[PDB]
Design an enzyme around this catalytic site. Structure first.
Site, PDB file in Angstrom:
ATOM      1  N   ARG A 132       0.779  -1.137  -0.224  1.00  0.00           N
ATOM      2  CA  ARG A 132      -0.224  -0.188   0.329  1.00  0.00           C
ATOM      3  C   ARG A 132       0.727   1.006  -0.125  1.00  0.00           C
ATOM      4  NH1 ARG A 132      -0.453   2.283   5.240  1.00  0.00           N
ATOM      5  NH2 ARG A 132      -1.934   4.356   4.933  1.00  0.00           N
ATOM      6  N   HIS A 169       2.124   6.091  -1.372  1.00  0.00           N
ATOM      7  CA  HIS A 169       3.472   7.192  -2.015  1.00  0.00           C
ATOM      8  C   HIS A 169       5.131   6.694  -2.762  1.00  0.00           C
ATOM      9  CE1 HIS A 169       2.749   8.070   2.531  1.00  0.00           C
ATOM     10  NE2 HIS A 169       2.259   8.955   1.902  1.00  0.00           N
TER      11      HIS A 169
END
Ligand SMILES: *P(=O)(O)OC[C@H]1O[C@@H](n2cnc3c(N)ncnc32)[C@H](O)[C@@H]1OP(=O)(O)OC[C@H]1O[C@@H](n2cnc3c(N)ncnc32)[C@H](O)[C@@H]1OP(=O)(O)OC[C@H]1O[C@@H](n2cnc3c(N)ncnc32)[C@H](O)[C@@H]1O
Ligand SMILES: *P(=O)(O)OC[C@H]1O[C@@H](n2cnc3c(N)ncnc32)[C@H](O)[C@@H]1OP(=O)(O)OC[C@H]1O[C@@H](n2cnc3c(N)ncnc32)[C@H](O)[C@@H]1OP(=O)(O)OC[C@H]1O[C@@H](n2cnc3c(N)ncnc32)[C@H](O)[C@@H]1O
Lengths: 133, 119, 132, 132
Positions: free
Chosen positions: C96, C101
């Protein structure tokens, strides 16, 4: 100019093309969840890259540290690096990102359709303002 | 002494870690707190053994921190108070925007818990 | 435990969403649009598991998460989920984080592997939480 | 000397306590109570060796140790213990940090390492003192 700025600007422009390409005209958009999912993801990739650009400038010129994602755009506006209405528009984009990612509120698809039509320019404005400095 | 001590830390770390990217000096700077970033995670034991090797060389307690496995809060504490001793700047900025932005999301994730503990 | 019943529904709806978009894998690695939907819903599952984990941590005062991975160790430190289950969910938090990011080039071969052999961890997690 | 025989006896008592509390190591990693007892008695060994080391440097005027690690350096510089033995005992000086801070999973694999491969360093140290 910076090495991190040129990459995030390249990421934003790549994702803007992806949002525009998937949202052809809206003929099957409001009925295809897969098209909705693809636009939401690239909208997030645009948001996080602007947040990343915002956090770099705040550190690279010692303008403070933002506790939240929105405060980063607030700091860029208080120091007159981005316009006050542009900072307000980018902060309201984070709200769309959070509501779409982990829903604490039912996603209004008419907002996502509206943002691809009249709000992609806010990302283009942001990279243009950052490109000058 | 600080400049001489700083170099000795650079030598030991560059010599015992492959593909070293960043050397940081956070905390109070007795008691030394050092954080590093490489291309791979460090072995739990091998890192501690190196920290004790640093601790023996500088005659002070040394805490070695792997920025590739360290918590997001600790990484924010390094980008906040910290002195980059070695490494490029593009890697420094890459790590700062990586941690600050990760920290901002975490701050939203755990604000419900923080408020409960703080009455 | 009212919000947990809703997030469990979100995980169940996103897992069905991931399975439908991937289908058989014939056009997955070649259709960027199909990848985007699978990556998004995989993230929604992670975000929903973190919310359930942090709710239990607040409803039971287990501690304060220092990272997103820390939210699942707290459940494991108090022996509320199995130690291998927390490690697998902590492997999902890493996936994730790479998608949200951009601190690494996203490996598609991992995502293909995770949809095949790791979606069961979400089904495992929602069952374990349903008991208590 | 009474204080040396007591510190040596304390080291021997704590090694016996660590071995009994840790058992085969199957339930160590899962029971905080077993970890706390092993970590605590590990600390009692460090201070007892540091006390013995500083005593000899004081009784034989070897020097004035400015640090706990430096007290082992003086014993080795006068060739009372081998330099590889002092390095292992100086590694234990940093072990006093694990108890004051409850970062459980970070250095739990470290306490396991010292219990398996480092208790003998205490046995060696008391052996050298008994010879004297
Ligand atoms: P999270 O807190 O991270 O962010 C969400 C957002 O919601 C606020 N908020 C907190 N607690 C709340 C409770 N309990 N109820 C309601 N709202 C709560 C937070 O303060 C946080 O920030 P903002 O309010 O500043 O965020 C505003 C932007 O969020 C998006 N958004 C809001 N509700 C949504 C739903 N139901 N579904 C999807 N997205 C939602 C929007 O992007 C919003 O921007 P905006 O409304 O200011 O303007 C965007 C743009 O869209 C046009 N537009 C608005 N309404 C439209 C309809 N119905 N149809 C078409 N187009 C529409 C606007 O004209 C403008 O151009
Ligand atoms: P974030 O900070 O959350 O950490 C994620 C990851 O990145 C490293 N890291 C930390 N700080 C960094 C900085 N500053 N720069 C660069 N990199 C940094 C961390 O050390 C961490 O690495 P880990 O290997 O510990 O992460 C474990 C899980 O993270 C996901 N993940 C890692 N790299 C990824 C890329 N490039 N793209 C997507 N996702 C990534 C994975 O979920 C991983 O879990 P796992 O691999 O242990 O288990 C899943 C499963 O997948 C199969 N598999 C692994 N590798 C494969 C390849 N190359 N091809 C096919 N299949 C693969 C295995 O079967 C495995 O069991």
């Amino acid at each position: 100019m910076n090495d991190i700025i040129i990459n995030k600007i390249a990421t934003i422009k790549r994702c803007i093309k992806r949002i525009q390409q998937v949202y052809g005209d809206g003929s099957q958009f409001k009925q295809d969840f897969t098209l909705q999912d693809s636009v939401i993801l690239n909208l997030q990739r645009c948001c996080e890259a602007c947040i990343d650009i915002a956090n770099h400038i705040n550190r690279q010129q010692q303008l403070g540290i933002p506790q939240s994602s929105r405060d980063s755009f607030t700091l860029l506006a208080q120091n007159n690096l981005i316009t006050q209405p542009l900072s307000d528009n980018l902060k309201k984009m984070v709200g769309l990102r959070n509501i779409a990612v982990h829903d604490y509120q039912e996603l209004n698809l008419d907002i996502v359709v509206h943002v691809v039509q009249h709000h992609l320019e806010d990302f283009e404005q942001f990279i243009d303002v950052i490109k000058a400095e | 002494m600080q400049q001489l001590n700083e170099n000795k830390i650079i030598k030991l770390l560059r010599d015992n870690i492959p593909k070293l990217q960043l050397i940081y000096l956070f905390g109070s700077y007795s008691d030394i707190d050092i954080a590093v970033l490489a291309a791979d995670t460090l072995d739990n034991i091998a890192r501690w053994e190196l920290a004790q090797k640093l601790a023996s060389a500088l005659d002070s307690d040394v805490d070695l921190v792997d920025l590739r496995s360290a918590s997001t809060v600790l990484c924010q504490q390094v980008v906040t108070q910290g002195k980059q001793l070695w490494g490029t700047q593009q890697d420094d900025e890459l790590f700062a925007v990586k941690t600050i932005s990760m920290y901002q999301h975490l701050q939203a994730e755990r604000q419900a818990i923080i408020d409960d503990v703080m009455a």
